[PDB]
Structure 1
Amino acid sequence: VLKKNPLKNKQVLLRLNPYAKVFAAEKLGSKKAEKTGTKPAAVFTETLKHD
């Protein structure tokens, strides 16, 4: 009869897309990406700054 918008009515969200439930625990926007020491080149820096 009626259309309930998931992104709320999380029952309806989980009627779809049940990966949300395990999405919850890890919370999967705060993916703390492992940082790396990959540094740039002097040619990159000088082409950037200098005319």
Structure 2
Amino acid sequence: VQKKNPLRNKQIMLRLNPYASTFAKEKLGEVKAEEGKPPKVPASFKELLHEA
């Protein structure tokens, strides 16, 4: 009788998607990147960028 927005109503989202509770609980939307020292940009790429 009345369409309820799952993005506004959390119970409707839990009805359609049972994973929403543990998606919010385990913070899979704030996942961090892989750890370790990132390498530096190659000089060739930099000399190609600032060409004539």
CA RMSD of aligned residues (A): 1.5
- TM-score w.r.t. the length of structure 2 is 0.78
- TM-score w.r.t. the length of structure 1 is 0.79
Runs of 4+, deviation exceeding 3 Å: none
Count of residue correspondences: 51
- Percent identity of the aligned residues? 59
List gaps (5 residues or longer) in structure 1. none
Supply the distance in 1 between the matched residues of 2:27 and 2:8 (Cα, whole angstroms).
Answer: 17
When you count helix as a share of all residues, which structure comes out higher?
1
List gaps (5 residues or longer) in structure 2. none
